[PDB]
Design a binder for this molecule. Structure first.
Ligand SMILES: *[C@@H]1O[C@H](CO)[C@@H](O[C@@H]2O[C@H](CO)[C@@H](O)[C@H](O)[C@H]2NC(C)=O)[C@H](O)[C@H]1NC(C)=O
Ligand SMILES: *[C@@H]1O[C@H](CO)[C@@H](O[C@@H]2O[C@H](CO)[C@@H](O)[C@H](O)[C@H]2NC(C)=O)[C@H](O)[C@H]1NC(C)=O
Ligand SMILES: *[C@@H]1O[C@H](CO)[C@@H](O[C@@H]2O[C@H](CO)[C@@H](O)[C@H](O)[C@H]2NC(C)=O)[C@H](O)[C@H]1NC(C)=O
Ligand SMILES: *[C@@H]1O[C@H](CO)[C@@H](O[C@@H]2O[C@H](CO)[C@@H](O)[C@H](O)[C@H]2NC(C)=O)[C@H](O)[C@H]1NC(C)=O
Ligand SMILES: *[C@@H]1O[C@H](CO)[C@@H](O[C@@H]2O[C@H](CO)[C@@H](O)[C@H](O)[C@H]2NC(C)=O)[C@H](O)[C@H]1NC(C)=O
Ligand SMILES: *[C@@H]1O[C@H](CO)[C@@H](O)[C@H](O)[C@H]1NC(C)=O
Ligand SMILES: *[C@@H]1O[C@H](CO)[C@@H](O)[C@H](O)[C@H]1NC(C)=O
Ligand SMILES: *[C@@H]1O[C@H](CO)[C@@H](O)[C@H](O)[C@H]1NC(C)=O
Ligand SMILES: *[C@@H]1O[C@H](CO)[C@@H](O)[C@H](O)[C@H]1NC(C)=O
Ligand SMILES: *[C@@H]1O[C@H](CO)[C@@H](O)[C@H](O)[C@H]1NC(C)=O
Ligand SMILES: *[C@@H]1O[C@H](CO)[C@@H](O)[C@H](O)[C@H]1NC(C)=O
Ligand SMILES: *[C@@H]1O[C@H](CO)[C@@H](O)[C@H](O)[C@H]1NC(C)=O
Ligand SMILES: *[C@@H]1O[C@H](CO)[C@@H](O)[C@H](O)[C@H]1NC(C)=O
Ligand SMILES: *[C@@H]1O[C@H](CO)[C@@H](O)[C@H](O)[C@H]1NC(C)=O
Lengths: 427, 338, 147, 237
């Protein structure tokens, strides 16, 4: 029907797709981590720092020879797209039935007396059995049996004091119920699974807030500005226009945020320039029509957009050619409500028919066409005032007019259980 | 103040002088027209979030239809108050109104504008399409209208401009001063202004010779009362509190809607693209559904409060239209209405 | 049109409430019996709670919009009761309350969900210019008209 | 011996840039107008508890303050942390020491701190008108340090204004800490001026100017006026 309708929104699509990673080429010592000749016992776990290298996790998880591979705040598929912060590797040997306890929020006494993960753990846990390398009668893998409390996350306890378990002390002496707190794994090549040794590596990292040294094997690209692109800055994907900035970042900062928690400033990894990020052009479209009982002609208003920035705001030649009747032309007119396309601006004034805004209306007039005009307030008039004249009427008219008013509305009821559940007794 | 009346059964008090009084009454008529693009508020550019949002039905069609209804009612509100007469009565050329001086409320004839002196004073006191298209450089990135615009929140202009509303009030003034109350019932019939004042004095029960014998005292009292209104508006800065309240409530509601986009609602992050960089779709879906539920709740709360405020300003505009037709186009006998 | 709007808004609100029953709200299906045909209760409960949450939200949105519309039609009916007693049971001096012109009398007619008033007014028609004066001097005394 | 802080001991709580906003933060802070213990020297250094974190200030002009000893029992049955400042670097070392009763440095350097370094797990090395301020924190196996230094003009005590501390280093030391001890460099080697405050869990409201700098804050549990300011999210009521 005749009117004006908000229908959808316009949005210019990005033009290129850039990637900006730090220029680095060294390879990460994952052979020195996984292919070590002797691992550590669990009560003294080994922590190795990983820094300033290119990591390729897909070799690890695809060419596995592994039994457990669980990543926690992250998916394994995305690991070759991110850059990482403060990367560390833990490594120890435990029993087969105790691989269960290396997880957030879990009991046992590996998890309670030896090695505790936090609940907000980000990183991966990797395990594989090692009976060919850790057998005979091997008595070189200790663990703790008794402590006074429970450990904190990422806390290491290496101290062998005699655990007092009665009421009386034992001053450096083993005696009545006073035990030595570490007891060795009884590994054999003759055990069943659940008692065979397993080797475990725990990687742990932070993601996407701080400057980064460790990342993945994908190749950088040129920096394109003043256009809508599809970027990636050390793992931070997005869309928008980039522009030189005047923000001075302190050296421990890489990104900046808005009040909607939106990234709007970034530091380049290769150049050390500060850029600002702003999305593409957009806005609402409104469609002015008469009835479809009347015509199939439309005018289009692009709301609060300047008229020369429209073929940037909608894209020119990503849409159909039947959207480029309505992007430039000769029926192009600039109101304060935006840019109107497809109507002829006349110089008259009329009563309003289809309102557009800020004094402008539209109608279907003369063959036929769509016109846009400034509306008229009414007929101009003037009174013949003086200081000694009066006008008196000599006749009159009896008038009858109507006034229509709503009084009541329809009374409805809902049966809640029949709306929500139908006739299901479980629901 | 404590007081007492000297009542007796054969005593009366009769007044021997009078005062001409001019007072002010201020009323809200319309509020700001807004729209929301929900897909840009809830999902941004993410087509995964956009395909997940179709599982919740027609909630955004419903919200847009509610806001379009409010926006149309604001232009009806303004028409109902100001467009009561359809003749644009022109300002009379020579001001000879029996000593009464109307120059501060009429539009000034040298300047081509339509505003009077007192309307200028009123438009410079309420601290309120132009920064839209802007916001590319980074010094324009700390104001609040760009952060609103980048998340799908828009302001629509009024149908009648300020110049048009001033043309309407100019025509109503010219009609009253040259015709009395005749132009509201029919055609305008001219009458001299002191004769119009004499029959209004007759309407409150005073004989018209009281006005004709005190005509210059009455015109001086009127001119002094207009000058006092002008001084109290020209130096006092809290007079339009009812109009400033509406602007403040609207800006506060839009700021709360923008700040709710930094809650995670129980997800791992409030940033959708940081969820999308770290997870694959079967476990990313669990996080994106929590974010979607929270943002839909925020929008529905905004739309409900807007509908209740729109009903309050509609009742206020109905009262303003009744006061226009009963106190400007007539003389009223209702006690304390005008 | 004012009476037809009230019928249209309410038919539209009921049709939206009926159509919201085909949304799955994040479940595997929007059909409760197709969820019940494929799953056993401890993990059918996860799907049915999602459907229950979505449908409760749809109903509460409907009921809130009905309360706001009912408040608007209550104000319209208060105005119509005032017009019945002040224009049909009396003659009114309020300018423009009972039609345009000077009010003589009004007649009511009934309509579907509403009321129509027929207002009869006096409108002055054909005017002449005259010269006028505030008073007339006869014998050193001023004379004013009585009406 | 006591002084009072007035405002001291606020730090940047994350590594994101923010400009021209207010922000609410819940963390471990030193409260406003707390009394802090004063240790002076005219002519002792005891062990002090740690208690969830420590604010440390020291003004000097002749380089007396050099490093600290952290650990739970300090007597070679558990590990402990050693931080020692040298002429042109710093030596961090997690190691099972046996510490002397009154450790110090001599006139040239005499490590008279420990007597048996054993089981040594972590080690690190990198590059009155001087005030320096420190915040130490020990949460889930790390050791965080925040620092700032400024030219003081004052005569006795800490100034009145606002300085925010920037992050220095994070160390994976993995141990349990209960007490701490300060190491000095004595004028003559005899084997026989700084302030200490404690951190509390608080809520603060922070302001950033146009250039990203923390310039003003409100301690929300100080008084009812600032509780009002935190409820309203403004500095003006
Ligand atoms: C960190 O060390 C402190 C110091 O020994 C431990 O606190 C002791 O805990 C035992 C628990 O059996 C109590 O009997 C002692 O009274 C505590 N002493 C003090 C001084 O508090 C604390 O348990 C250790 N933390 C962990 C996680 O083991
Ligand atoms: C009353 O007198 C006035 C003044 O002479 C008349 O106003 C003029 O009307 C003519 C139309 O015939 C116009 O061309 C003039 O411009 C008007 N003059 C002014 C000053 O406005 C008015 O028409 C007379 N009224 C009647 C009913 O005859
Ligand atoms: C007052 O106006 C009425 C119009 O309603 C005039 O009546 C008309 O007069 C003409 C000529 O006599 C007739 O052709 C019409 O048929 C009459 N209309 C009706 C409804 O009867 C009336 O003459 C006018 N009176 C004066 C004094 O001007
Ligand atoms: C009625 O009140 C007016 C005040 O509004 C009186 O007018 C004042 O009279 C005094 C003395 O004659 C003058 O000083 C003032 O300047 C007058 N005011 C104005 C505005 O002219 C008036 O005299 C009173 N009349 C009676 C009969 O009491
Ligand atoms: C009507 O009132 C205005 C008050 O604003 C008078 O305007 C001032 O008159 C003085 C003369 O005493 C001039 O010095 C000012 O320049 C005028 N101000 C303006 C803004 O024009 C005006 O004179 C009064 N009308 C009459 C006929 O006296
Ligand atoms: C570890 O060593 C085996 C052979 O012993 C080799 O096949 C494998 O690729 C090595 N892995 C790494 C990460 O170096
Ligand atoms: C590598 O990064 C450095 C950092 O400034 C830069 O100077 C150099 O040009 C970069 N190399 C290439 C090939 O871009
Ligand atoms: C369409 O328009 C024509 C012309 O106005 C009218 O006769 C016809 O009834 C309309 N169609 C409907 C369904 O009303
Ligand atoms: C639209 O752009 C042109 C050229 O940049 C400019 O002259 C004009 O002022 C702009 N329109 C508005 C409404 O500012
Ligand atoms: C309308 O009038 C203006 C004069 O200001 C003129 O420039 C313009 O061309 C006119 N439009 C048409 C369609 O004639
Ligand atoms: C802390 O110092 C202030 C300074 O006046 C003092 O009032 C207060 O009593 C001190 N605290 C305690 C617990 O004594
Ligand atoms: C301290 O500084 C001196 C000066 O060169 C240096 O030789 C020495 O290695 C440093 N470290 C220690 C522990 O003495
Ligand atoms: C710690 O050192 C002692 C002796 O210095 C040694 O016997 C022991 O094996 C070491 N390692 C531990 C307790 O893990
Ligand atoms: C912020 O930085 C600008 C540019 O250096 C400087 O002019 C201004 O003084 C700074 N603001 C303050 C409060 O120092």
């Amino acid at each position: 029907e005749k009117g004006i309708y908000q229908t959808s929104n316009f949005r210019v699509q990005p033009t290129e797709s850039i990637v900006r990673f730090p220029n680095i080429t060294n390879l990460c010592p994952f052979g020195e981590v996984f292919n070590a000749t002797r691992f550590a016992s669990v009560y003294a776990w080994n922590r190795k720092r990983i820094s300033n290298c290119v990591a390729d996790y897909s070799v690890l998880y695809n060419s596995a020879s592994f039994s457990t591979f669980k990543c926690y705040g992250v998916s394994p598929t995305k690991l070759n797209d991110l850059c990482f912060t403060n990367v560390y590797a833990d490594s120890f040997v435990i029993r087969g039935d105790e691989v269960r306890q290396i997880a957030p929020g879990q009991t046992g006494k590996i998890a309670d007396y030896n090695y505790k993960l936090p609940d907000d753990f980000t990183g991966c846990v990797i395990a594989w059995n090692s009976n060919n390398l850790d057998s005979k009668g091997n008595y070189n893998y200790l663990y703790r049996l008794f402590r006074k409390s429970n450990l904190k996350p990422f806390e290491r306890d290496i101290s062998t004091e005699i655990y007092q378990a009665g009421s009386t002390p034992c001053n450096g002496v083993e005696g009545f119920n006073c035990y030595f707190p570490l007891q060795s794994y009884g590994f054999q090549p003759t055990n069943g699974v659940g008692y065979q040794p397993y080797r475990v590596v725990v990687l742990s990292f932070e993601l996407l807030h701080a400057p980064a040294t460790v990342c993945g094997p994908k190749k950088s690209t040129n920096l394109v500005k003043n256009k809508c692109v599809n970027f990636n800055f050390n793992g931070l994907t997005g869309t928008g226009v980039l522009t030189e900035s005047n923000k001075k970042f302190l050296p421990f900062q890489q990104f900046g945020r808005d009040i909607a928690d939106t990234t709007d400033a970034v530091r380049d990894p290769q150049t050390l320039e500060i850029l600002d990020i702003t999305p593409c052009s957009f806005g609402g479209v409104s469609v002015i029509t008469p009835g479809t009982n009347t015509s199939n002609q439309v005018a289009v208003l692009y709301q609060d957009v300047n008229c020369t920035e429209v073929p940037v705001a909608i894209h020119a030649d990503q849409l159909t050619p039947t959207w480029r009747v309505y992007s430039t032309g000769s029926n192009v007119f600039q109101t304060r409500a935006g840019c109107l396309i497809g109507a002829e601006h006349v110089n008259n004034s009329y009563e309003c028919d289809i309102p557009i805004g800020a004094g402008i209306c539209a109608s279907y007039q003369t063959s036929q066409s769509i016109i846009a005009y400034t509306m008229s307030l009414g007929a101009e008039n003037s009174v013949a005032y003086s200081n000694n004249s009066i006008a008196i009427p000599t006749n009159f008219t009896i008038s009858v007019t109507t006034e229509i008013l709503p009084v009541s509305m329809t009374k409805t009821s809902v049966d809640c259980t029949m709306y929500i559940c139908g006739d299901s007794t479980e629901c | 103040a404590e007081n007492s009346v000297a009542y007796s059964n054969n005593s009366i008090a009769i007044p021997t002088n009078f005062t001409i009084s001019v007072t002010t009454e201020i009323l809200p008529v319309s509020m700001t027209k807004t729209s929301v693009d929900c897909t840009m508020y809830i999902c941004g550019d993410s087509t995964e979030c956009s395909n997940l949002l179709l599982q919740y039905g027609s909630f955004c069609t419903q919200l847009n239809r509610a806001l379009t209804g409010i926006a149309v009612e604001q232009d009806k509100n303004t028409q109902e108050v100001f467009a009561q007469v359809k003749q644009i009565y022109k300002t009379p050329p020579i001001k000879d109104f029996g000593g009464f001086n109307f120059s501060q409320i009429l539009p000034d004839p040298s300047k081509p504008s339509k505003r009077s002196f007192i309307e200028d004073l009123l438009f410079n006191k309420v601290t309120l399409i132009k920064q839209y298209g802007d916001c590319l450089g980074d010094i324009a990135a700390r104001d609040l209208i760009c952060a609103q615009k980048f998340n799908g929140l828009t302001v629509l202009p009024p149908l009648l401009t300020d110049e048009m509303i001033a043309q309407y009030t100019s025509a109503l003034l010219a009609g009253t001063i040259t015709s009395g109350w005749t132009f509201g019932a029919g055609a305008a019939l001219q009458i001299p202004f002191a004769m119009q004042m004499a029959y209004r004095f007759n309407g409150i029960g005073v004989t018209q010779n009281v006005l004709y014998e005190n005509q210059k005292l009455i015109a001086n009292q009127f001119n002094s009362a207009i000058g006092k209104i002008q001084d109290s508006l020209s130096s006092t800065a809290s007079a339009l509190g009812k109009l400033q309240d509406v602007v403040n409530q609207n800006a506060q509601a839009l700021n709360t809607l923008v700040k709710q986009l930094s809650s995670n609602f129980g997800a791992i992050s409030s940033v959708l693209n940081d969820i999308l960089s770290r997870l694959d779709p079967p476990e990313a879906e669990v996080q994106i559904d929590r974010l979607i539920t929270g943002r839909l709740q925020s929008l529905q709360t905004y739309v409900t409060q807007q509908l209740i405020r729109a009903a309050e300003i509609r009742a206020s505009a109905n009262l303003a239209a009744t006061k226009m037709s009963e106190c400007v186009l007539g003389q009223s006998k209702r006690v304390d209405f005008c | 049109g004012k009476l037809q709007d009230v019928v249209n808004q309410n038919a539209q609100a009921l049709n939206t409430l009926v159509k919201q029953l085909s949304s799955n709200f994040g479940a595997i299906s929007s059909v409760l019996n197709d969820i019940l045909s494929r799953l056993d209760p401890p993990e059918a409960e996860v799907q049915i709670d999602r459907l229950i949450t979505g449908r409760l939200q749809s109903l509460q949105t409907y009921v809130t919009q009905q309360l706001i519309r009912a408040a608007e039609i209550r104000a319209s009916a208060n105005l119509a009761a005032t017009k019945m007693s002040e224009c049909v049971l009396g003659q009114s001096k309020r300018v423009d309350f009972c039609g345009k012109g000077y009010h003589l009398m009004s007649f009511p007619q009934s309509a579907p969900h509403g009321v129509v008033f027929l207002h009869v007014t006096y409108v002055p028609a054909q005017e002449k210019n005259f010269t006028t004066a505030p008073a007339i001097c006869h014998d050193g005394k001023a004379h004013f008209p009585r009406e | 011996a006591y002084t009072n802080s007035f405002t001291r001991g606020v730090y940047y709580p994350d590594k994101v840039f923010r400009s021209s906003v207010l922000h609410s933060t819940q963390d471990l802070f030193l409260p406003f107008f707390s009394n802090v213990t004063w240790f002076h020297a005219i002519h002792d250094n005891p062990v002090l508890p740690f208690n969830d974190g420590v604010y440390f200030a020291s003004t000097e002009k002749s380089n007396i303050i050099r490093g600290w000893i952290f650990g739970t029992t300090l007597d070679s049955k558990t590990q402990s942390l050693l931080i020692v400042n040298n002429a042109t670097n710093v030596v961090i070392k997690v190691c099972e020491f046996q510490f002397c009763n009154d450790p110090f440095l001599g006139v040239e350097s005499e490590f008279r701190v420990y007597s048996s370094a054993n089981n040594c797990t972590f080690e690190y090395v990198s590059q009155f008108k001087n005030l320096r301020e420190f915040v130490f924190k020990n949460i889930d196996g790390y050791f965080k340090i925040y620092s700032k230094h400024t030219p003081i003009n004052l005569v006795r005590d800490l100034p009145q204004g606002f300085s925010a501390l920037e992050p220095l280093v994070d160390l994976p030391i993995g141990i349990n800490i209960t007490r701490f001890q300060t190491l000095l460099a004595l004028h003559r080697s005899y084997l026989t001026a700084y302030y200490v405050g404690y951190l509390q869990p608080r809520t603060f409201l922070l302001k950033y100017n146009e250039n990203g700098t923390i310039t003003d804050a409100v301690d929300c549990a100080l008084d009812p006026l600032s509780e009002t300011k935190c409820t309203l999210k403004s500095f003006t009521v």
